Every structure is written in structure tokens, then in C-alpha cells.
Design a protein around this ligand. Structure first.
Ligand SMILES: Nc1nc2c(ncn2[C@@H]2O[C@H](COP(=O)(O)OP(=O)(O)O)[C@@H](O)[C@H]2O)c(=O)[nH]1
Ligand SMILES: *C/C=C(\C)CC/C=C(\C)CC/C=C(\C)CCC=C(C)C
Ligand SMILES: [Mg+2]
Lengths: 442, 197
């Protein structure tokens, strides 16, 4: 009694696939969404503490020992892949248009800190903090102020606001030169505001950097304190909310359902459907994460180490903040990639009272990945427990137009979700042939 | 407008037992024969007067996620009461209640209130789950029991009012205070509010 025909079959319930499922169902498409796993979230799921031990430890501890040290398993929602939301980012725009805010609550992240020579400093979130910050000297702050005034008064359609600069012809380094900004200021803007993980952007057209810096400023302006929001109960609430949106608009969901076989149109290599323990389902195209079609994906060459740490106290030198980001610019450690730390606690309902979660991550560049994180571990003070893992980043070999197999990218090392929504918009364009246009749900 | 307490209620149970029709009968006073909706019910808000107090209820429905049992932690967040529904003409739907109780034990708070509802009681000729058997099971699982009919309205309003009373009378003073209008703001942000560049 299960329909065999659908407009779209989606495999894996990571957030990229769940947003696409919700949007396609809202568009009126008949969607079948299947996951071989017994829970939502895919690689960016939030898991309980017992699940964290099963996944990262050799000999998981007993329930009695776990509860005496950490409390009830239900108080824990631990992200496997850390991500914050820019307050004015595209995911917030999708959340408001789809009303998925009905299924997920958000709280501000207290602040973002940048590392400089062994110490961390809170990045300003208002003018009083900007005046107080020792990150820049008095004369350099005056130049920085002119640069920020240009970021806000710039209007694409009005050449008189460009101050002689062209975002497509000029490189970001040329933009810095026009404002006379020194190297330390370039590092702060590039790594703390644009959030680039290295300095390659200096020799590239300024446009993408300008957009990222403006996004940061607009995000801080939304609620103050920092440019980020974080969901109550963890990132896993997001794929679950979009899966509910898809279900409301007609989507059909199956979990714990392996794909016995992918079916292809005779001699064409084009997707036709899937065979499962519940039957065979057909659709002209499939949307899926790399774990369903490893042969159709390739490594980007990057491996990311993620160290999930549990603390029984606030992070040192953060004024007892309930949540924060720490950015360690690669220039401060002679590295090729920045190291990030994402910190949340019971204020966001991700762990029991008194504990903090600090997830450290970076792109691996040495033979001893654990040692690359030592500068970040040192910022946390005593660590109760560490759950370490290394993930390789994959991307599709092709865009799916030739085989109707539209694949998402592995979740990357960036500290927030803008690159994930870029993947959602790109996949949507590949699947439908036109750009995503959000409609306000009634 | 103003209310004394705001509660979050959920409906749960096997596909086809009448959860969506029960909610529509309580919220809109309507019933559609052979109900089929392209867009599923999300939730309904209803304010009732309960023993002198104004109680606002946000009642959630499953959006069909129970078809292949794909409802997880998100649906149960912040829930105060859960109404478990079965169909008195479907033995398997009653057997399914044991599994739903295990899901509630896993995802909801240990203090969540529960109510058992045997729906479609208008189908007198096709009843297979006897009232006494269901009542004994409800007593064994610490929950009140009512047989309802979204079709003819039997006990529908009373099932939701019974759950609202269960919550209001069972909550600790601290938990009840958290549902008052004065404590509605939990410190979360409103993504649609005006900016504070
Ligand atoms: N006879 C009868 N049919 C009912 C009753 N409630 C719901 N139904 C029918 O049973 C089917 C499933 O109802 P639905 O509300 O979609 O239940 P759900 O799948 O649990 O949400 C529809 O054909 C309804 O019209 C009831 O009280 N009596
Ligand atoms: C719209 C953005 C606001 C209100 C704040 C965010 C500004 C940041 C992150 C820049 C920091 C600038 C410094 C430290 C330089 C001094 C600049 C002034 C005192 C305007
Ligand atoms: Mg229903």
C-alpha cells in the first residue's frame, strides 16, 4: 500500500537534504526521504552522551558511571560537527520564510574571541567595546573606522559611494591599501570578520570578502553581543524541523531503511529508483549525501579533525560566558588553516547543568593531528573528557545533470552554516533548473 | 489576549486512528468524512476556561511522521502532556500503545502527563478493543482513559480538558509558574523582530 512513484527521492537526513526536502515539498513535489540510519541528522546530527561514547570510545562506560559524572542522557545534545548561524545569514532567511522557527528556538551566542600570542580577546560587538579593545592602536582604529563606514555606505547602484574601488576588478589587498590598513588589521578583518581560514582571499576579487564582512556587521547589528545564533537543544533540531516541514507538505519519511540497490535506466547510468526492505520506489531524480554514492564523489584533499571536549567549568578568560566562538588565526601558529573552538553549555540545553561543551576543529596539516590542537586545548583549562574523530571532506565528481544523482558536499571546516546554505541553493538550481525563490509560508 | 497558563500538548499514536480529526473536531468543531488532507495539520491553539483559570493550549499533531515511526526528540521538546490515541476497531493500534509509551519514556520529561484515548467509538459494530481491557491497561500505565469519536463528538472536548486539568493539577509550583504569561519570554530571540550599521 505504499506509493511506488515520486517526483524526488532524497537519501540521508543531514540538514542539506532536509532543507531541500522541505523546500521541494513546499513547491508541491511528492517527496520520499529515506535514511539508512535510525535517527535524523546525518553527519551533522546532535547525539546523546551514551551515543557519543559508543561512537568515539573503545569501552563505553556504564549508565551508572555516566549519570554520576554527567547526569541524565536526555540533558545532552552534542553536535558531531560544530556550526553557528550568522544572525543575518541565509539559513535565518529560510527559517523565517518556511516558519521552521515554529519547531526550533534560538538563543544568541555571547561573543567571538580572537587569539593573539597565547591570549584571547573578545571581538567588539558594539562601539563601546570597539573603543576599549586593545586589538588596534588609536591611529589604526581611525583608519578601520573609515573602512567600516565604506562597508556600510557602499551602494552597488551608486558609483559615488564606491570611493574609487571596484569590487570585481580590485583585490581585497587593494581595498586594504586604499584605507591604509596594516598587516595586523588585515588579519583581524580577514579572519575575525570575513572568517577566511587563510590569506588566499588577499589576491582575489574583493566582492566575496566585502559580502562576508557586511554579513558579519549586519549579523552583529541584529541582536548585539555577537554575530551568531545557536539552536536550543542543538544543531540536530534543524534537520528535524525541516523534515517536519516536508512531512506537513506531503513528504514521506523512512528511517533505519538501507538502500538494497540503486536502480538505473538500462545502459544510460541515469537514476531510476531504489530497492528497500519496504519495496521499490521510483523517481526521475535523487538527492543524496556522499555516503549513498561514494563512487560518484571525490575527496577535496582536506581532512578535518574535530575534538569534542566536555568541561565542568566555564572557559578561562571569557568572563564566564555561556557560549562563544574562539578563532585562532593561522598566522599566530605558523599554520595554513585557522583553528576554531565552538563553546555552548546548559544555557542552550546541550548538556547538564554545570558542564560546557567545547568543540575544537581544524584542517589537518601534519602527521600528528592531535598535536596540532594543543594550542586550543590549552585555552580550555581542565578537560573532563575528549571525543576525537577525523573526517575526510568529499564533493560530487559531477553536478548530477547527466545521471540525475544530485549530491551534497560533506560539512566543511567553516565555523558557521553559510557554506551549507550555499550548497542547498546550488543543488536546488541543479535539480530544478532555476534559482531558489523563497515564498513566505502562510 | 491574556491567559493564566500556557501548556504544550501532543497527539501520538498509529496512523489512521483519528488524531488529526480529533484535533480538528476540538479546534474547529468540524469533521470531514473519509478525511484526507494534502497539507497536514501542524498545531492548533485554543484557549479554554478551566475551573476559574484561563488556559491557553498549543496542541501539536504528527504531520504523518508516525506512518513509518519517524518521530524523534524534536516533537517532544517542552511538552507538558501527551494524548496517546488508538482506534477501538483496530487491535494492532491498541497494541501499538506500548511502543508509543516507550518513545515517550525516552524523549519526554519524566513528569509529562499522559492520557489514553480509544477513538472511533461510533463504530459500535466494529469495536474489537473492549473498554475494560483498555481501562485496565491505562490504569497499569498511570493514565486516565476515555473513548471518543471525532465523527460524532463523543468525549472529544472532555479528552482535551481532562489533559489540561491533569497538567494544571499535577505540576509543581515551579513548573506551573514557568507556564504563566509573565514568564512567556524564555530569553530566546525572535527572528522576525526589528534589528536593534
Ligand atoms: N468512524 C470514524 N472515523 C474516524 C474518526 N476519526 C477519524 N476517522 C477517519 O479515520 C481516518 C483517519 O483519520 P485521521 O484523522 O487522518 O487520523 P490520523 O492518521 O491518526 O491522523 C479518516 O478516514 C477519518 O475520516 C472517528 O471518530 N470515527
Ligand atoms: C555594524 C557593526 C558594529 C556596530 C560592530 C562590529 C565591529 C567590529 C567587529 C569592528 C572592530 C573595530 C575596531 C576595534 C576599530 C575601532 C572602530 C570604531 C571605534 C568605530
Ligand atoms: Mg494525521
Amino acid at each position: 500500500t505504499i506509493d511506488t512513484d515520486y517526483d524526488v527521492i532524497v537519501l540521508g537526513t543531514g540538514i542539506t537534504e532536509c532543507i531541500l526536502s522541505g523546500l521541494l515539498s513546499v513547491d508541491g513535489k511528492k517527496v520520499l526521504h529515506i535514511d539508512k540510519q535510525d535517527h535524523y541528522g546525518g553527519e551533522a546530527a546532535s547525539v546523546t552522551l551514551s551515543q557519543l561514547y559508543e561512537k568515539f570510545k573503545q569501552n563505553p562506560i556504564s549508565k551508572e558511571e555516566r549519570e554520576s559524572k554527567f547526569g541524565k542522557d536526555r540533558d545532552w545534545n552534542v553536535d558531531l560537527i560544530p556550526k553557528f548561524l550568522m544572525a543575518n545569514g541565509e539559513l535565518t532567511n529560510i527559517l523565517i520564510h518556511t516558519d521552521v522557527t515554529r519547531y526550533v528556538d534560538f538563543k544568541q551566542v555571547s561573543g567571538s574571541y580572537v587569539f593573539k600570542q597565547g591570549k584571547i580577546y573578545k571581538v567588539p560587538a558594539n562601539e563601546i567595546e570597539a573603543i576599549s579593545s586593545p586589538l588596534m592602536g588609536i591611529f589604526e582604529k581611525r583608519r578601520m573606522k573609515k573602512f567600516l563606514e565604506w562597508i556600510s555606505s557602499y551602494k552597488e547602484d551608486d558609483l559615488s559611494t564606491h570611493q574609487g574601488l571596484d569590487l570585481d576588478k580590485n583585490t581585497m589587498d587593494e581595498v586594504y591599501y586604499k584605507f591604509g590598513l596594516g598587516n595586523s588589521t588585515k588579519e583581524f578583518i580577514g579572519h575575525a570578520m570575513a572568517l577566511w581560514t587563510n590569506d588566499d582571499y588577499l589576491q582575489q576579487p574583493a566582492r566575496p570578502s566585502f559580502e562576508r564582512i557586511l554579513l558579519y556587521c549586519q549579523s552583529v547589528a541584529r541582536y548585539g553581543k555577537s554575530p551568531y545564533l545557536y539552536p536550543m537543544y542543538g544543531l540536530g533540531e534543524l534537520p528535524q524541523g525541516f523534515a517536519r516541514l516536508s512531512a506537513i507538505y506531503g513528504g514521506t519519511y523512512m528511517l533505519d531503511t538501507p538502500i538494497d540497490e540503486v536502480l538505473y535506466k538500462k545502459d544510460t547510468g541515469k537514476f531510476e529508483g531504489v530497492k528497500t526492505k519496504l519495496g521499490t520506489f521510483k523517481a526521475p531524480l535523487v538527492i543524496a549525501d556522499p555516503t549513498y554514492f561514494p563512487e560518484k564523489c571525490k575527496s577535496t584533499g582536506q581532512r578535518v579533525i574535530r575534538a569534542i571536549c566536555i568541561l565542568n567549568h566555564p572557559v578561562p578568560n571569557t568572563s564566564n560566558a555561556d557560549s562563544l566562538q574562539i578563532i585562532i588565526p593561522q598566522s599566530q601558529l605558523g599554520r595554513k588553516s585557522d583553528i576554531y573552538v565552538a563553546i555552548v553549555s546548559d544555557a542552550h540545553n546541550v548538556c547538564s547543568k554545570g558542564h560546557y561543551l567545547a568543540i575544537i576543529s581544524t584542517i589537518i596539516e601534519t602527521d600528528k593531528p592531535h598535536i596540532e590542537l594543543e594550542p586550543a586545548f590549552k585555552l580550555l583549562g581542565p578537560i573532563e573528557e575528549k571525543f576525537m574523530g577525523i573526517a575526510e571532506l568529499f564533493e560530487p565528481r559531477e553536478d548530477g545533470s547527466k545521471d540525475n544523482i544530485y549530491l551534497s558536499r560533506s560539512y566543511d571546516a567553516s565555523s558557521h552554516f553559510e557554506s551549507m546554505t550555499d550548497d542547498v541553493k546550488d543543488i536546488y538550481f541543479r535539480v530544478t533548473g532555476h534559482p531558489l525563490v523563497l515564498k513566505q509560508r502562510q | 489576549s491574556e491567559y493564566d497558563y500556557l501548556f504544550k500538548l501532543l497527539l501520538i499514536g498509529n496512523s489512521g486512528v483519528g488524531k488529526s480529526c480529533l484535533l480538528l473536531r476540538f479546534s474547529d468543531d468540524t469533521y470531514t468524512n473519509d478525511y484526507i488532507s494534502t497539507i497536514g495539520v501542524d498545531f492548533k491553539i485554543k484557549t479554554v476556561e478551566l475551573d476559574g483559570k484561563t488556559v491557553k493550549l498549543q496542541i501539536w499533531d504528527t504531520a504523518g511522521q508516525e506512518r513509518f515511526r519517524t518521530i524523534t526528540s524534536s516533537y517532544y521538546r517542552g511538552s507538558h502532556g501527551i494524548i496517546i490515541v488508538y482506534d477501538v476497531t483496530d487491535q494492532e493500534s491498541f497494541n501499538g500503545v506500548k511502543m508509543w509509551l516507550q518513545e515517550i519514556d525516552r524523549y519526554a520529561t519524566s513528569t509529562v502527563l499522559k492520557l489514553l484515548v480509544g477513538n472511533k467509538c461510533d463504530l459500535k459494530d466494529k469495536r474489537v478493543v473492549e473498554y475494560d481491557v483498555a481501562k485496565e491497561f491505562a490504569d497499569a500505565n498511570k493514565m486516565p482513559f476515555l473513548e471518543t469519536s471525532a465523527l460524532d463528538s463523543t468525549n472529544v472536548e472532555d479528552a482535551f480538558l481532562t489533559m489540561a486539568r491533569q497538567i494544571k493539577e499535577s505540576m509543581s509550583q515551579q513548573n506551573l509558574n514557568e507556564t504563566t504569561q509573565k514568564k512567556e519570554d524564555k530569553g530566546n530571540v525572535n527572528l522576525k523582530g526589528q534589528s536593534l550599521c
